């Protein structure tokens, strides 16, 4: 009563009462696909098969490369070269996971490349230059790997991934890129600024100094014509450590929707007049992190303002409410919170919000 064949080369048994049944993913992948009738009565699970495991064969080649123990910059370059083609939830999850191991390997090589003797002529300088060059290479490749992954036409794989895993994988994207940013900041030579940006992801890692009088920091300067985040000169001095502050701003286009509206703390009002009211992240995700702090609620001396633009600008979105994504590093699962953030002004094109934390 519950057997059928799907377009992705997957047939099924007839489970007289919704019994488990799986068949391999279509020729060209390595995963499988389960699909049993929702009710024991005998009705196809309308959700269809879960193509959440199938992944392109490039996964295996990179896996052995991670084993070969080569410099992670080369592996990161190779990953982007493959992610140009059609993407899969398995490829997404594999790249997300890979971007976590490469950091560990880099950490190992950074620990290894440490002065271990008298600097005869330029040994320490050569080690530092090699590190900075390789680390700049890693983050430059990371902006490319995320450019490829957040391709607008690649949302089909993101939707295939279950709601629970799609927010978790996206949360890990936010976590691995900020780790890479802070690593780049820690390996900058003399308080310089690095800005590797692309159509989807824009990144600015800048190691600044708290000496004398300092200026404010704004990202992006004028690119994006909107969605601009800004800190204050006083905040820089507050989060200063021994005349050094590692700052990292990032703007993500085409990632917001993948983040689910779990436990959203929007404050609604009289405008709520829909029996089937829905919520939508109608704004590009802007992000800022300071002094190697992931999620510890660091309070700011002066507020942080972000004029995030509207994805869909018409009069069908009754009211706005600014939010922030809080996630537990251990579970990599998070939720939208309006805590410490208050709407300033709103209109059709943009919306400025004031938060107390970064």
């Amino acid at each position: 009563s519950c057997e059928a064949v799907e377009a992705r080369e997957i047939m099924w048994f007839k489970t007289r009462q919704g019994q488990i049944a799986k068949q391999p993913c279509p020729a060209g992948t390595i995963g499988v696909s389960t699909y049993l009738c929702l009710a024991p009565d005998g009705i196809w699970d309308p959700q269809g098969p879960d193509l959440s495991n199938c992944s392109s064969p490039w996964v295996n080649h990179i896996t052995q490369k991670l084993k070969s123990g080569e410099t992670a910059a080369n592996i990161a370059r190779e990953l982007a070269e493959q992610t140009r083609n059609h993407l899969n939830a398995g490829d997404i999850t594999y790249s997300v996971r890979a971007m976590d191991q490469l950091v560990g390997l880099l950490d190992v090589q950074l620990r290894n490349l440490t002065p271990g003797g008298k600097d005869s002529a330029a040994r320490s300088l050569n080690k530092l230059q090699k590190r900075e060059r390789s680390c700049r290479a890693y983050v430059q490749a990371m902006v490319e790997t995320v450019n490829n992954l957040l391709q607008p036409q690649a949302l089909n794989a993101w939707r295939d991934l279950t709601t629970s895993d799609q927010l978790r994988a996206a949360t890990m994207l936010l976590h691995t890129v900020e780790e890479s940013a802070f690593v780049l900041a820690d390996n900058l030579l003399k308080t310089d600024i690095v800005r590797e940006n692309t159509d989807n992801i824009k990144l600015e890692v800048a190691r600044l100094s708290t000496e004398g009088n300092l200026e404010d920091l704004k990202f992006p300067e004028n690119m994006g014509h909107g969605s601009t985040i800004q800190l204050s000169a006083n905040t820089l001095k507050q989060n200063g450590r021994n005349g050094e502050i590692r700052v990292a701003f990032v703007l993500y286009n085409n990632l917001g929707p993948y983040l689910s509206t779990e436990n959203a703390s929007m404050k609604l009002g009289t405008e709520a007049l829909s029996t089937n009211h829905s919520v939508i992240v109608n704004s590009p995700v802007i992000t800022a992190a300071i002094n190697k702090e992931f999620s510890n609620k660091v309070y700011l001396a002066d507020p942080v303002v972000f004029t995030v633009k509207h994805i869909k600008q018409s009069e069908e979105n009754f009211n706005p409410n600014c939010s922030f994504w809080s996630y537990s590093k251990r579970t990599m699962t998070g939720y939208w919170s309006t805590q410490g953030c208050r709407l300033l002004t709103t209109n059709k094109t943009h919306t400025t919000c004031s938060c107390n934390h970064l």
Partner: antibody, heavy 122, light 105 residues
Framework: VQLVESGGGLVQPGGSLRLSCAASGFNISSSYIHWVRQAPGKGLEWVASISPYSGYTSYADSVKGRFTISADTSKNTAYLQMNSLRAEDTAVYYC?????????????????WGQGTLVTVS | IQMTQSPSSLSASVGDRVTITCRASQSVSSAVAWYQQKPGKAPKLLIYSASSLYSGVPSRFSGSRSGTDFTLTISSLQPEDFATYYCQQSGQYPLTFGQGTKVEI
């Protein structure tokens, strides 16, 4: 909205005093606090400041260390403790306020002040 | 950062113009506010960021900025406006002030 400040009088040099500033009509947990003094026949001079959410303190180099500003939002009162007072501090101290939430607009604009506390050193 | 406020004295006539400048030693993008301290009273906010006057302040005043010399113009000295005007850098700590000009017919 009131910012009455008290705690003045004669204090022998190198003594210790404690300023009070009761704020009514608004909460100091979400509003800044600023101390600006005015020496006899001189100009307004910045003394200290506290962020109401971070407790970030910053004193003018003139009063570094010797002065420690406190913000007890519990009693809706601000305090400027004045340890090791020097004869260069004799002035009228005013506790001013600026709305933290709206900082970018009206940047550090002291909307409301107070009558003032006069302290003398002899 | 340090500023200067010249002239420190004037007797602008009732209805005529006052122009108090403010030499800014270092390039500070706007972020300068003029305060008015009525003799024996508390300084009030007049202009914020050398651009627009604060809600409630007579529209007679007007803040302008040339990039380095911030200026204030009282369109006409209504005789209830003779006091000491100041020039404060409101960009970052330290919140330094100026010498002070005195409009005294």
């Amino acid at each position: 909205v009131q910012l009455v400040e008290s705690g003045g009088g004669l204090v022998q040099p190198g003594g210790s005093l404690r300023l009070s500033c009761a704020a009514s009509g608004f909460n100091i947990s979400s509003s800044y606090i600023h101390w600006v003094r005015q020496a006899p026949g001189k100009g307004l001079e910045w003394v200290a400041s506290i962020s109401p959410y971070s407790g970030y303190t910053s004193y003018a180099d003139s009063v570094k260390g010797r002065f420690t500003i406190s913000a007890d939002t519990s009693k809706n009162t601000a305090y400027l403790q004045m340890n090791s007072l020097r004869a260069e501090d004799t002035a009228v101290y005013y506790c001013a306020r600026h709305n933290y939430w709206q900082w970018w607009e009206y940047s550090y604009a002291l909307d409301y002040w107070g009558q003032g506390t006069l302290v003398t050193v002899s | 950062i340090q500023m200067t406020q010249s002239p420190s004295s004037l007797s602008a006539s009732v209805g005529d113009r006052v122009t108090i400048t403010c030499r800014a030693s270092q390039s500070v993008s706007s972020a300068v506010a003029w305060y008015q301290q009525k003799p024996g009273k508390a300084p009030k906010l007049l202009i914020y960021s050398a651009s627009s006057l604060y809600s409630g302040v007579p529209s007679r005043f007007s803040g302008s900025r040339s990039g380095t010399d911030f200026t204030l113009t009282i369109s006409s000295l209504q005789p209830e406006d003779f006091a000491t005007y100041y020039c404060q850098q409101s960009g970052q700590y330290p919140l330094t002030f100026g010498q002070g000009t005195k409009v005294e017919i």
